[PDB]
Amino acid sequence: HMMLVLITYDVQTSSMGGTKRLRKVAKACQNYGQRVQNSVFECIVDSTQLTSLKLELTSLIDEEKDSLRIYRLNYKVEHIGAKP
Amino acid sequence: HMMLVLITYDVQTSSMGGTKRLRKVAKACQNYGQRVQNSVFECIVDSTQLTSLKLELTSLIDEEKDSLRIYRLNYKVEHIGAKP
C-alpha cells in the first residue's frame, strides 16, 4: 500500500516570501521523497504519510496565490534537458 | 490507446528568454491539452501525437538550462490553493 505520488507546486519565486514558501515545501516533501525539478516532487508514501504530508503542505502554501497538485500514480517517466 | 500525459517544465522565467520559452512550450502543449498550472500540462494523446509533441518540445527548450519531465498515466488528482 505504498504509493508513488507526484506533487507539483506553483509559486511565484520573484518574491522573497514565495522563495521561502518553496524552500519550506521542498523541505516538507523531501522527508518523504525527492525533488526532481525546482518545484516538482516524487514521494513514495502510504496513506497515513500522505494525509500527514497533505496537511503540512496546506499550512505552508499561500492558498490565495499558490497552488499545489497531487497526483496518485505499483508504478513511466522521461526526462529531457538539464539534470537538476 | 489515448493516454493521459503529464508534462512538467522547469524554466527560469526571471529572464525574457526563459519567459518566451515557457510561452512557446505552453502553446505547443495546449494543442494537445490543458495548462493546469504555470508550467504543468495535462495532455490526452495517442502514440503518434506524443512522438510529435516530444519532438516539438525538444526544439523549444534550452536543454542546458531547462528540464522537462513526461509522465505517462485509462486513468486521481487533487488541487489545493488558488485556481489558475
Side-chain angles (χ1 to χ4, degrees), chain A residues 34-40 42 79-84, chain B residues 8-10 63-69 71:
Chain A
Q34 182 186 0
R35 193 177 186 176
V36 299
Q37 285 168 311
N38 196 46
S39 59
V40 178
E42 300 183 344
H79 186 105
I80 294 164
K83 298 298 189 65
Chain B
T8 60
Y9 182 33
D10 192 350
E63 287 168 293
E64 306 254 65
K65 305 206 304 163
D66 313 342
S67 71
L68 186 133
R69 293 174 73 83
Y71 297 84

Side-chain angles (χ1 to χ4, degrees), chain B residues 14-42:
Chain B
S14 82
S15 68
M16 67 190 114
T19 286
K20 176 207 291 191
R21 297 199 297 281
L22 171 57
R23 183 161 51 255
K24 286 181 176 180
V25 166
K27 179 48 168 43
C29 292
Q30 283 175 120
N31 182 29
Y32 301 97
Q34 182 186 0
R35 193 177 186 176
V36 299
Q37 285 168 311
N38 196 46
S39 59
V40 178
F41 308 87
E42 300 183 344

Side-chain angles (χ1 to χ4, degrees), chain A residues 6 8 10 37-38 42 54 63 66-73 75-82, chain B residues 6 8 10 37-38 42 54 63 66-73 75-82:
Chain A
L6 226 219
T8 60
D10 192 350
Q37 285 168 311
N38 196 46
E42 300 183 344
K54 192 183 171 191
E63 287 168 293
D66 313 342
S67 71
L68 186 133
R69 293 174 73 83
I70 301 170
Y71 297 84
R72 284 178 210 207
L73 318 183
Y75 181 114
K76 56 179 271 138
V77 190
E78 299 176 311
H79 186 105
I80 294 164
Chain B
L6 226 219
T8 60
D10 192 350
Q37 285 168 311
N38 196 46
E42 300 183 344
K54 192 183 171 191
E63 287 168 293
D66 313 342
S67 71
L68 186 133
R69 293 174 73 83
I70 301 170
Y71 297 84
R72 284 178 210 207
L73 318 183
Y75 181 114
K76 56 179 271 138
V77 190
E78 299 176 311
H79 186 105
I80 294 164

Side-chain angles (χ1 to χ4, degrees), chain A residues 1-62:
Chain A
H1 69 23
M2 303 300 299
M3 313 170 270
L4 180 56
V5 169
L6 226 219
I7 296 167
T8 60
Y9 182 33
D10 192 350
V11 55
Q12 256 277 73
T13 56
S14 82
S15 68
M16 67 190 114
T19 286
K20 176 207 291 191
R21 297 199 297 281
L22 171 57
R23 183 161 51 255
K24 286 181 176 180
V25 166
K27 179 48 168 43
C29 292
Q30 283 175 120
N31 182 29
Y32 301 97
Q34 182 186 0
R35 193 177 186 176
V36 299
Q37 285 168 311
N38 196 46
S39 59
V40 178
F41 308 87
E42 300 183 344
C43 305
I44 302 164
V45 288
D46 65 18
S47 291
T48 293
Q49 290 170 329
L50 181 58
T51 293
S52 183
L53 172 61
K54 192 183 171 191
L55 198 53
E56 185 177 10
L57 289 183
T58 297
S59 75
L60 294 177
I61 74 170
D62 188 328

